[PDB]
Amino acid sequence: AVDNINKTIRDFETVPGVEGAALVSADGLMISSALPETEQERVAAISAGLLSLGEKATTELDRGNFKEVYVKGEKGYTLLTSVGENALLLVLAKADAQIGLIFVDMRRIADSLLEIL
Amino acid sequence: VDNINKTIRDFETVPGVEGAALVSADGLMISSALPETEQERVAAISAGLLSLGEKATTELDRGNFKEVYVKGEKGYTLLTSVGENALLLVLAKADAQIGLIFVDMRRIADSLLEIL
């Protein structure tokens, strides 16, 4: 269960444009990452912050149970998909990444990690 | 002011578009066709989506805020910057084509910026 989760998350970083991928709990704690060892505690805290305010969007405007959220800035994308209850998958990319298809890969791998986790 | 209004009734025609609104960055509604009871509330909710969208785009070094996407199982909330001091919110159905509606918003967001 643990060998197969680590390798699945790092393989995202073999797509053109993808910098990092972290599997984080809903409550802000790091499960499995390949990001720099320094930033791993502060990125897991921000991830859970983005999950909670995506929840607000969907509840408050009558849109159904939360699925996905992405933010585009000047320099790059932040991309987040729910892993059933209690977990979530983060991808960072730059402006030249092919966002619609990463969400299709993210959706399939979420349900894969959901069985073995 | 007549050329800002019906310009927001026209997105509804496109398939998958439940509702549009022009809102201020402080949370006061400018132009919308939504139920005239909800409009004050919906102006408040789009307020936070921008700020809490500016907080990921300032904490993870992604540059200036441009756009925010959320998706729920019964549909989508989309928001784009209408320059400084306003924003365009679009409620869509969970079977609409997002990549095009963004192409239609980001142009209109710079065709309302010069007359507003």
Author numbering:
A (entry chain A): 4 to 120
B (entry chain D): 5 to 120
Quoted passage from the original study:
Here, we take a structural approach to assess the relatedness of these eukaryotic-like proteins in Asgard archaea, the closest known prokaryotic relatives to eukaryotes. Asgard archaea roadblock, longin and TRAPPC3 domain-containing proteins form dimers similar to those found in the eukaryotic TRAPP and Ragulator complexes. Here, we adopted an X-ray crystallography approach to compare the structures of a potential Asgard Rab small GTPase, several RBs and two TRAPPC3 proteins to their eukaryotic counterparts, with a focus on Thor and MKD1. We conclude that the emergence of these protein architectures predated eukaryogenesis, however further adaptations occurred in proto-eukaryotes to allow these proteins to regulate distinct internal membranes.
The proteins (Thor-RB and MKD1-RB) were purified, crystallized and their structures were elucidated via X-ray crystallography to 2.14 and 2.69 Å, respectively. Both proteins are homodimers formed from protomers comprised of 5-stranded β-sheets sandwiched between a single α-helix (formed between strands 2 and 3) and a pair of α-helices (formed from the N- and C-termini). We compared the structural similarities of Thor-RB and MKD1-RB with MglBs and eukaryotic RB proteins. Both proteins displayed approximately similar levels of homology with the RB proteins M. xanthus MglB and H. Sapiens LAMTOR2, matching ~110 residues with an RMSD of 1.5–1.6 Å. Lower levels of homology were seen in comparison with longin domains (86–94 residues, RMSD of 2.5-3.0 Å) and profilins (96–102 residues, RMSD of 1.7–2.7 Å). These homologies indicate that the RB fold is highly conserved between all domains of life and that the profilin and longin domains share a core structure with RB. Despite the similarity in structures, Thor-RB and MKD1-RB display different surface charge distributions. Thus, we hypothesize that MKD1-RB may be a membrane-interacting module, whereas Thor-RB, which lacks the basic patch, may be a scaffold protein for protein:protein interactions. The Odin-RBLC7 structure shares a similar homodimeric structure to Thor-RB and MKD1-RB but lacks the terminal pair of α-helices observed in the RB structures.
